[PDB]
Design an enzyme around this catalytic site. Structure first.
Site, PDB file in Angstrom:
ATOM      1  CE1 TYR A  98      -6.098  24.868   8.599  1.00 46.54           C
ATOM      2  CE2 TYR A  98      -6.136  23.112   7.527  1.00 46.54           C
ATOM      3  CZ  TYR A  98      -5.758  24.368   7.397  1.00 46.54           C
ATOM      4  OH  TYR A  98      -5.502  25.066   6.373  1.00 46.54           O
TER       5      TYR A  98
ATOM      6  CG  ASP B 230       1.501  30.688   7.587  1.00 45.14           C
ATOM      7  OD1 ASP B 230       1.274  29.732   7.943  1.00 45.14           O
ATOM      8  OD2 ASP B 230       0.948  31.192   6.100  1.00 45.14           O
ATOM      9  CG  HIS B 231      -0.632  29.318  11.800  1.00 42.57           C
ATOM     10  ND1 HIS B 231      -1.955  29.543  12.618  1.00 42.57           N
ATOM     11  CD2 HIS B 231      -0.758  29.405  10.609  1.00 42.57           C
ATOM     12  CE1 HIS B 231      -2.658  29.948  11.558  1.00 42.57           C
ATOM     13  NE2 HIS B 231      -2.142  29.625  10.224  1.00 42.57           N
TER      14      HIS B 231
ATOM     15  CG  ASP C 133      -5.796  27.582  12.039  1.00 41.44           C
ATOM     16  OD1 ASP C 133      -6.367  28.528  12.152  1.00 41.44           O
ATOM     17  OD2 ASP C 133      -5.109  27.456  11.070  1.00 41.44           O
TER      18      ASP C 133
ATOM     19  CD  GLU D 201      -2.495  23.238   5.284  1.00 44.97           C
ATOM     20  OE1 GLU D 201      -2.325  23.038   4.024  1.00 44.97           O
ATOM     21  OE2 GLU D 201      -3.753  23.154   5.857  1.00 44.97           O
TER      22      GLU D 201
END
Length: 266
Positions: free
Chosen positions: A119, A256-257, A158, A54
């Site tokens: 991802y 947020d990870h 991810d 991301e």
DNA sequence: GCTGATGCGTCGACGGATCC
DNA sequence: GGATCCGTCGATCGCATCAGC
């Protein structure tokens, strides 16, 4: 319940010292992440290889801080032709680098192993993209299986699924939510069976709950450790004797990870 | 050039029903 | 009648484009 990752195990089960440290991090916007001191944390972690997801940044707009990384000077970037995007940064030059199977996958061959960072597509709010995710899972498995090298595989990144109920705080209420549908859970199981691969963290910590790598920004979820384990290192079976530890860097902010880190004795 | 509005992709809290 | 189960809804952030000055 809050969670405290155990100390780093830098020695393999047979007593060999780790030689290779890989870190993976969904950064939720590389430029924002840099402004939130994410690169200061990377420098303290000092991995040999850094995989980012991301990035939301094309190569021409990479901040100048990224060419001040002398220990991570070999850098490869892929984006869809300000969303998505992945990066791989390495102390030593890989032998080969390729992209895809969309800006979601980088494959890098090293001396003794192949690294894939991914991802994985999100099934979406209301599962509007679940069928695409299932078709993508199937194509990805076939791609990884069909990798030409006889070298062992490390897959990291991810993967956008919490495999089992132990991998997220609210399994009951989330079984129709992206990341915990029976379809996504099944695809992860098939990935492990088909390639084959082992879940490094779960191999070492098979009964440990409350170990997450993602918390929604909403509702102060991270402060309550109401999270999901979406980020993984998956290993070929033959690399398990080399596995020293698989970490969840819960305290590292900026996204947020949180980052995850692998230590291998190669 | 810069700001802010808007659009897009990215679930835990809550209210209600059922079960024994 | 506490525990559980289920469906509904408002909402964080980063990055884009667009409008205006």
């Amino acid at each position: 319940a809050l969670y405290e990752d155990p100390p780093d195990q830098k020695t393999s089960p047979s007593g060999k010292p780790a030689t290779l440290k890989i870190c993976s991090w969904n950064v939720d916007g590389l430029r924002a992440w840099i402004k939130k001191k994410g690169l200061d944390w990377v420098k303290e972690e000092a991995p040999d290889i850094l995989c980012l997801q991301e990035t939301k940044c094309s190569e021409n707009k990479l901040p100048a801080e990224l060419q001040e990384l002398p220990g991570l000077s070999h850098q490869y970037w892929s984006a869809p032709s300000g969303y998505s995007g992945v990066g791989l940064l390495s102390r030593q030059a890989p032998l080969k680098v390729s992209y895809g199977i969309e800006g979601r996958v980088i494959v890098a061959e090293f001396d003794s192993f192949v690294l894939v960072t991914a991802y994985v597509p999100n099934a979406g709010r209301g599962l509007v993209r679940l069928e695409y995710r299932q078709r993508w899972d199937e194509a990805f498995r076939k791609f990884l299986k069909g990798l030409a090298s006889r070298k062992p595989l490390v897959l990291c990144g991810d993967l956008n699924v919490a495999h089992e109920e132990i991998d997220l705080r609210n399994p009951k209420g989330n079984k129709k939510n992206a990341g915990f549908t029976p379809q996504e859970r099944q695809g992860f199981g098939e990935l492990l069976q088909a390639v084959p691969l082992a879940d490094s963290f779960r191999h070492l910590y098979p009964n440990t709950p409350y170990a997450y790598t993602f918390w929604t920004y909403m509702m102060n979820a991270r402060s309550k450790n109401v999270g999901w384990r979406l980020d993984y290192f998956l290993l070929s079976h033959s690399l398990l004797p080399a596995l020293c530890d698989s970490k969840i860097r819960s305290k590292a902010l900026g996204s947020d990870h949180c980052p995850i880190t692998l230590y291998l004795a190669l």
